[PDB]
Amino acid sequence: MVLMTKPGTSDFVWNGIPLSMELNLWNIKEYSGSVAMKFDGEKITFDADIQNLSPKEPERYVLGYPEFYYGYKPWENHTAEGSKLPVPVSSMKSFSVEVSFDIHHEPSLPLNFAMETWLTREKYQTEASIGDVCIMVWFYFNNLTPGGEKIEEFTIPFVLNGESVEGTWELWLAEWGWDYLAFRLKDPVKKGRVKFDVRHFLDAAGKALSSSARVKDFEDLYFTVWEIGTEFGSPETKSAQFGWKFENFSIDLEV
Numbered sequence: 001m002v003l004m005t006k007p008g009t010s011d012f013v014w015n016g017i018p019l020s021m022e023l024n025l026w027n028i029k030e031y032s033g034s035v036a037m038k039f040d041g042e043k044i045t046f047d048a049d050i051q052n053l054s055p056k057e058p059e060r061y062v063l064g065y066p067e068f069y070y071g072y073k074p075w076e077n078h079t080a081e082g083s084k085l086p087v088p089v090s091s092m093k094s095f096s097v098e099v100s101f102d103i104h105h106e107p108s109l110p111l112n113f114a115m116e117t118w119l120t121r122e123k124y125q126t127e128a129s130i131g132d133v134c135i136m137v138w139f140y141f142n143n144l145t146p147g148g149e150k151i152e153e154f155t156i157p158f159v160l161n162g163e164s165v166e167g168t169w170e171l172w173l174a175e176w177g178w179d180y181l182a183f184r185l186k187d188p189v190k191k192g193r194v195k196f197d198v199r200h201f202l203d204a205a206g207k208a209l210s211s212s213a214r215v216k217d218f219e220d221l222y223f224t225v226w227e228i229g230t231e232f233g234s235p236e237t238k239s240a241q242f243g244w245k246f247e248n249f250s251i252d253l254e255v
């Protein structure tokens with residue numbers, strides 16, 4: 001059992017895969033109340049009942065992103081030992097990700113269930129800047145839209161509860177300190193099991209950024225990490241009650 005009740009990171013191994021869990025309240029300046037994140041060998045759970053919230057920077061909009069991840073998260077300069085990432089995007093033949101999840105939250109809270117990676121020019125950067133890319137995949141959202149603006153839609157297959165389906169994904173793009181691309185599933189799923197190949201999203205992103213003047217050689221960027229978690233909160237959020245459970249996690253990176 002790994003149990004955290006304050007912001008921090010812990011490495012763990014689940015089904016033979018080395019991972020990191022981060023009770024991530026990155027944009028919260030202050031709060032009162034409770035947070036708890038736990039891994040017990042079969043599932044990872046997170047619960048929060050916090051109040052008196054204020055952001056470190058409202059321009060960033062969200063307040064936090066409790067999560068777990070496989071690989072190297074640039075911002076924390078951290079990877080658990082034994083990860084196959086980072087690798088150049090061009091070396092990835094396929095990268096299957098599967099996980100069961102159940103998200104619960106008070107109705108008014110801005111929240112998503114989103115996975116993400118950071119594509120960087122150098123292998124072990126400690127930040128993203130111009131030339132780098134953040135790609136997110138949102139399977140659920142409540143009172144929250146992605147940053148930037150919606151520019152396209154893509155039809156990308158995934159397996160939902162064991163059944164192959166074709167999802168329709170909106171692609172939202174923002175040019176900030178780095179390029180932000182968020183694919184948002186149009187029929188969000190709040191509880192279920194999903195399995196999909198990240199390569200489809202990398203392919204769509206590479207097409208969308210083909211005429212970019214900021215992102216130069218997409219396929220030469222390093223795919224550093226795969227994060228799974230829930231962003232939550234807006235600049236007006238003063239309290240947050242929500243949590244989640246993730247189970248049945250597996251990956252298959254073919255390089």
Ligand SMILES: OC[C@H]1O[C@@H](O[C@H]2[C@H](O)[C@@H](O)[C@H](O[C@H]3[C@H](O)[C@@H](O)[C@@H](O)O[C@@H]3CO)O[C@@H]2CO)[C@H](O)[C@@H](O)[C@@H]1O
Pocket residue numbers: 024026062064065075076116134136180231
């Ligand atoms: O303490 C280490 C380092 O953390 C920096 O915060 C990171 C977070 O760790 C990371 O989760 C967050 O990712 C968000 C991203 O910025 C958004 O564009 C979008 O992708 O959603 C992500 C999850 O909400 O990025 C921030 C950095 O921007 C601290 O900022 C830094 O001071 C600190 O040293």
Ligand SMILES: OC[C@H]1O[C@@H](O[C@H]2[C@H](O)[C@@H](O)[C@H](O)O[C@@H]2CO)[C@H](O)[C@@H](O)[C@@H]1O
Pocket residue numbers: 059060061062136143144145146147148182231
């Ligand atoms: O850290 C940035 C954050 O942006 C979130 O979208 C915000 C956007 O930043 C803001 O300009 C717009 O007015 O509101 C949206 C929220 O509805 C985005 O949802 C996050 O993924 C991203 O992390």
